[PDB]
């Protein structure tokens, strides 16, 4: 590969982007803008990182469900102390 | 499997943008109508593995979030008691 322009598999977001120009779906193009914009701004899901890797993407979706799981899955434990200290009150 | 169209819907069901994403399901199904692709452009597998994960994700956060709420709920049920 000499002096090749490098092309990487980019972020979901900007994959959908390019998939809708390239189909001329011009309108859904617009949709989907909108409503993700509104969407980051009512931050139902606010995604941190803007970093355009689809392979930093995975990563950063298994460090949320390893770094969360162990809490929330302490949290369900937590629950059940709960009810143990209820019951002995 | 990993057709695009069931791809982009699955998405948008994810994100919960699918009500205003019906306009693109119609723009699609009108342009397919028209013959613009008769094929799909196949969904890369790091894309498909990035939509698992992000449901696989979205399962966990939702399903022990409910656990924090319940969790308080009890810790005002032993503070009563």
Same mark, same amino acid.
């Given at each position: 590969?000499?002096?090749?322009?490098?092309?990487?598999?980019?972020?979901?977001?900007?994959?959908?982007?390019?998939?809708?120009?390239?189909?001329?779906?011009?309108?859904?193009?617009?949709?989907?803008?909108?409503?993700?914009?509104?969407?980051?701004?009512?931050?139902?899901?606010?995604?941190?990182?803007?970093?355009?890797?689809?392979?930093?993407?995975?990563?950063?979706?298994? $460090? $949320?469900?390893?770094?969360?799981?162990?809490?929330?899955?302490?949290?369900?434990?937590?629950?059940?102390?709960?009810?143990?200290?209820?019951?002995?009150?």
């Amino acid at each position: 590969k000499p002096g090749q322009v490098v092309k990487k598999p980019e972020v979901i977001d900007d994959f959908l982007r390019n998939f809708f120009i390239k189909m001329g779906l011009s309108r859904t193009c617009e949709c989907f803008e909108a409503e993700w914009y509104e969407l980051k701004a009512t931050g139902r899901l606010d995604n941190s990182t803007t970093v355009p890797d689809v392979y930093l993407r995975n990563a950063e979706l298994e $460090d $949320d469900v390893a770094g969360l799981r162990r809490e929330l899955a302490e949290a369900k434990s937590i629950a059940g102390r709960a009810s143990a200290t209820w019951d002995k009150f």
